[PDB]
Amino acid sequence: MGKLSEQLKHCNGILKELLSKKHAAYAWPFYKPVDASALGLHDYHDIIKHPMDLSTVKRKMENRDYRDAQEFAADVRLMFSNCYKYNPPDHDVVAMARKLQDVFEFRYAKMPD
Ligand SMILES: COCC(COC)n1c(-c2cc(C)c(=O)n(C)c2)nc2cc(N3CCOCC3)ccc21
Structure with missing residues (x-):
């Protein structure tokens, strides 16, 4: 029940x-x-x-x-930043990155204390 373990469980759920x-x-x-x-x-x-x-x-x-x-x-975030760095901002892959990063950030923000 260590804090690092519990936060890593939340991370694994986000990943899944x-x-x-x-x-x-x-x-x-x-x-x-x-x-x-x-x-x-x-x-x-x-x-x-x-x-x-x-x-x-x-x-x-x-x-x-x-x-x-x-x-x-x-x-x-390195994965998303790589996408925003390489691709023109109007490319389909960028819109897809934005959407998936929205999923990530909103659930990452529900991290247990
Ligand atoms: C929506 O993404 C379009 C880009 C096109 O790049 C030329 N793209 C990337 C891609 C992804 C990222 C994050 C990126 O930055 N670039 C530049 C390309 N990976 C891909 C993989 C595939 N296929 C077809 C289905 O089977 C698997 C292989 C097809 C397209 C792909």
């Missing part, structure tokens, strides 16, 4: 929700690492120094890599 069918219509571009070569995005790794995606957040949670909620939240 972001990966759930409820949000699938807009969450899917964040499921796997951006495959820059496959998508023809040959500048992606010159612009984004620290790629992040929900499969990587899941592997790090399963590995007990995150020591607290703050470390978890940093990777999820």
